[PDB]
């Protein structure tokens with residue numbers, strides 16, 4: 217089995233889901249898989265380029281293997297959840313950042 | 314005949330798009346400013 | 354943010370792979386000069402092979418045979434031959450055969 | 451300096467540390483848990 | 499990749515309001531505003547002190 221970063225050619229008998237844009241989904245394109253907001257994007261992939269990689273060496277865009285539309289992968293949004301409070305020797309109310 | 318190869322024979326090293334980066338890689342390239350042979 | 358659903362897309366190609374043309378061939382060569390077939394651009398149902406009542410060994414490395422049917426490969430080479438059954442010990446990675 | 455420290459922290463996610471591949475979702479999708487517990491643990495030990 | 503950047507507490511505009519106040523203290527009232535109240539003094543005389 218060769219498992220190279222090159223575009224894949226020998227694929228499992230998988231379902232072929234409909235594409236959804238602008239919502240968070242757990243994608244798998246040609247066996248390359250992750251989670252993100254998928255958006256169609258302006259990025260001028262040359263016709264021989266099959267995906268985009270970032271300054272971080274992360275996968276950043278892909279070309280759907282059933283439609284040559286350039287999907288940007290933006291990670292599903294995240295952050296620290298901080299609690300603002302007076303002392304419990306004043307009130308049990310809180311606000312959340 | 315031997316002739317200058319300057320700044321030539323670069324190619325996209327893989328099928329990956331990479332906008333706005335100074336990427337770096339080890340691969341088979343024409344050495345810069347070496348000699349290409351010329352024929353007739 | 355949590356994902357809504359998974360989206361699976363291998364390419365459009367429904368062409369079945371020739372695993373039943375290799376695993377049934379009349380004359381696997383002497384292990385001296387093995388026959389290799391280069392599988393590409395087809396659907397590989399390896400769960401025809403993993404489920405088989407035939408195979409005495411199904412040892413796998415860097416891939417699990419139960420995960421193998423929901424994956425994709427850049428090519429697959431089916432290197433085929435005959436040996437005395439004891440010699441299976443030398444058909445393994447890193448063994449000093 | 452603060453940029454060269456953070457770029458080096460980021461680039462080191464792509465390093466293998468003796469694991470089969472630094473894309474942790476590839477290890478998880480390709481290997482069953484008794485073998486993945488050995489491959490993930492090499493990435494954890496490097497990334498930590 | 500799990501990296502995040504928190505904002506500073508004082509915005510760069512609020513930092514300019516502190517430097518403005520330190521300028522106005524130093525120009526209108528010499529060293530006095532470091533010791534308590536800004537006692538005004540004319541700037542030609544401040545420079546003589």
Ligand SMILES: *[C@@H]1O[C@H](CO)[C@@H](O)[C@H](O)[C@H]1NC(C)=O
Pocket residue numbers: 282283365
């Ligand atoms: C995908 O497969 C269908 C038949 O199942 C075919 O009609 C269609 O043209 C294919 N799409 C592409 C982009 O090749």
Ligand SMILES: *[C@@H]1O[C@H](CO)[C@@H](O)[C@H](O)[C@H]1NC(C)=O
Pocket residue numbers: 315316317318346347348
């Ligand atoms: C090319 O080869 C010659 C010898 O044939 C050598 O003297 C020269 O330095 C090389 N480079 C160029 C650009 O001529």
Ligand SMILES: *[C@@H]1O[C@H](CO)[C@@H](O)[C@H](O)[C@H]1NC(C)=O
Pocket residue numbers: 373376377401402405407
């Ligand atoms: C042998 O060929 C038959 C069809 O003739 C097929 O059903 C079977 O899967 C093949 N054997 C193996 C070991 O797959």
